[PDB]
Homo-oligomer: A and B are copies of this chain.
């Protein structure tokens, strides 16, 4: 209470993800998860980005605006409910324009306000001797197969959106999560994707529709 500091977004995320549900736990292994960072008036000049052409990945500090709280403690986790509500993700930088970044392998909701962009520095950010017992390894993963209709539908909508719809669906579903006959759904881009569990360890994509 004896110190308050005010932050304002430098830009907003426009993302493939419209819901928190099927957003990957290992985002950088979902490289088809694409999105853009639309930068705000004073940070939209190309000069604020000069040099990023030689950096592959960037950190984004952002606000968990849809995370609406100290058995693990909050500071031992990467949970979205935190005392100052700030997130941090490293995403691949595919390219950039004047007031726009093209991002890949994101774990960010659509409409995420971004407070900062930091270049990933391997000698400082990749700690080889780091060990995390609660982490250890990315999530296990599930096999994904396609109905013939869904494969064709993902291809059509992929050509329409100019997005790798099929790969994103496959990469998101290999995580996910129950019932064997139930079809589940997620909104990706402007699409509704439906799937089910023909076997406890196999997901089958049913249909992709706008």
Q: Indicate whether A68 reaches chain B with its CB closer than 8 angstroms.
A: no
Which 6 interchain pairs have the tightest Cβ spacing? A54-B133, A51-B76, A75-B117, A51-B72, A56-B131, A51-B134
Which residues A71-88 have CB closer than 8 A to chain B?
71-78, 82-86, 88
- Assess whether A75 is in contact with B90, with CB atoms less than 8 Å apart: no
CA–CA, A183 and B84, complex, Å: 44
Cβ proximity bits A136-154 to B, threshold 8 Å, 1 near / 0 not:
1110000000000000000
Q: Is the CB of B5 within 8 A of A85?
A: yes
Binds B, one of A122-130, A169-177, A192-200: A122-130
A135 surroundings in chain B (CB, below 8 A): 55, 119, 121-124
Among the 9-residue stretches A15-23, A41-49, A157-165, A201-209, the one with 4 or more Cβ atoms under 8 Å from chain B is A41-49
